[PDB]
Every structure is written in C-alpha cells, then in structure tokens.
Structure 1
Amino acid sequence: STSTSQIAVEYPIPVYRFIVSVGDEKIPFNSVSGLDISYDTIEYRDGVGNWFKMPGQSQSTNITLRKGVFPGKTELFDWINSIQLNQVEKKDITISLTNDAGTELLMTWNVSNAFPTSLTSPSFDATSNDIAVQEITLMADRVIMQAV
C-alpha cells in the first residue's frame, strides 16, 4: 500500500519525460545523449614503492540532441549555418526530467557555452516507415546536475 506522495520521494525517475531548452527557446527533442563528466588521471610512481593517483585535466563535453524534421521549422539548422570563421553564438542548454504535463521539475542538468558542430541530415530511404530525424552535436563545458 504505497501512497502516491511516497512514490514522489522514494522511487526512481523515468527518462522519457524531459524538457530541453536551448538558450531562450525551448524546443521538443526526441533524445539527448552524451552529457557526461570525465577526468584524465595523473599517476606518479617513484622507486620506494608509493603510487600517487590524482584527478587531472578535465575533458571537453560533447552532447548529441536528436529531433524530427517539422515542415515550417529549421532553427537547429540556422544555428549551425551562422558559423562565420570562429564566431558563433554560444548558448546554454538545460535538460530537465519532469512529470506528466510538466509543471514540476525533478532533476536538472545545465550545459554552458554550447555551440553546434555536425548537423546530420535525414537519410532519405524509399523503403522505410520512419520520420525524418536530425542529430545536432554540441561541444560545451561544465555539465552540472541540479536537484529539482
């Protein structure tokens, strides 16, 4: 006999309900991938036997967002088309696990200074029953995870 407010505190969070917000816009995405912290390890070892292991230089964060092609809207493409030589508008991406008809966040990830590389066009295919989907890849720094 678990109460419905006990499940909100004790139970794990399902992945499939999430909100992605790219800058000021919020746009519906099919899937989000990557988005993990990582560290190189520095190892010193000298002759008397002691072995030092340290966290080292952080690694660059690479995120992949996947989204279907909608008939009026290309604002994933216009972001990657605006790249002149090294100047692009970087913007913050927030992923947020929500409840059904999300008025309440459960977890929140924050990405800083994300800019697009490698927008992937759909694979046109005459014998396929799929939607035209696009992956955009983002390079960024500082994934942080926020409670609620």
Structure 2
Amino acid sequence: EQIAVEYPIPTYRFVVSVGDEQIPFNNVSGLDVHYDVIEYKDGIGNYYKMPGQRQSINITLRKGVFPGDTKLFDWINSIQLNQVEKKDIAISLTNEAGTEILMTWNVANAFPTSFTSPSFDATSNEIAVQEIALTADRVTIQAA
C-alpha cells in the first residue's frame, strides 16, 4: 500500500556562484563529460573497446546587462599573454523555497575564452543580454 511517486526537479531552480560570489545568471549549459574511444582489432575476431582520454569542459553562461555591471568583461579583459585568473564555478539545484541544496555541479579552474555583447536591434522590444564562454578542467556532480 501507499505507493510513493517522485517527480524530477524543475530546471529553473538553480543558483550559480563564480569564484566565491553568487551571480544571478539567466542560462547555463555545456556541463558535459566526454571520453574518446580507443579500439583495437585482432585477426581472429577480437574487438577491444576502452575509454580514452577525457576532454576539457566548455561552458557558456548567459545573463542580462544591468547598469554599473561589467564584472564578466573585466574578467575577460584582464588577460595578459597566457596569464589569467582562474576560478571555480558551482551550479546547484535548490528546493522550492531556496533554503536547501539538492544537487551540485562543480567546475574547477574555469577561465574566459569568448564574450558576446548584446545584439543592438532598434526594432526589438526584448532585453539586452550578454554571454560568456569558459574553458575548464573537470566537472563533478555531488548529491547533497
């Protein structure tokens, strides 16, 4: 008796922190893990398939533009040759009230690689939105 049913978490209940500060973002995507496949074949019919080298992480974060707010462009603009400040990102799925954490996506050593300014369209009534693309080392999912 008393069959219990659980539904998946809605995709809009998340919180993003960059470095050690929390930044309200609009969209986060690209938190994928990819492995190459190494194959070896024998003449007698053996076919070996094993995981290969893990690839780097590419993450794109998207948010609107607000007055007196240029932190992302300041981050991308502080690049000198190969020197840049690397930060750890953390995206967490929260409950409805937002007082608890259910799952966490941990991204380590992410630095900016591209910045996209809003498309200024005089014939549109939408909001101006900026985008930034980061390259990181490794992602890890931790259940709280």
Q: TM-score range by the shorter chain?
A: over 0.9
2:85 partner letter: E
CA distance in 2, matches of 1:100, 1:68: 23
Residues 1:138 and 2:134 aligned together = yes
1:105 to 93, 101, 105: 101
Could you list the per-position Cα deviations for residues 119-146 of structure 1 after superposition, in whole angstroms to 9, with x for gaps in the alignment?
A: 0000000011111101100000110001
CA distance in 2, matches of 1:127, 1:100: 37
Superposition RMSD on alpha carbons, in Å? 1.3
Structure 2 residues without counterparts, runs of 5 or longer: none
Residues 1:85 and 2:81 aligned together = yes
Q: Shift of residue 47 of structure 1?
A: 0.4
Provide the secondary structure at the position in 2 that maps to 1:83. coil
CA distance in 1, matches of 2:64, 2:104: 23
Q: Shift of residue 101 of structure 1?
A: 3.9
Scaled by the length of structure 2, what TM-score is found? 0.95
CA distance in 2, matches of 1:73, 1:101: 27
CA distance in 1, matches of 2:68, 2:85: 23
Name the stretch that deviates more: 26-35 or 93-102. 93-102
Provide the secondary structure at the position in 2 that maps to 1:67. strand
Could you list the per-position Cα deviations for residues 88-115 of structure 1 after superposition, in whole angstroms to 9, with x for gaps in the alignment?
A: 0000000001123411011100000000
* Aligned match of 1:14: 10
Identity among equivalent positions (%) equals 80
Could you list the per-position Cα deviations for residues 14-69 of structure 1 after superposition, in whole angstroms to 9, with x for gaps in the alignment?
A: 11011000001110000001010000000000101010000001111000000100
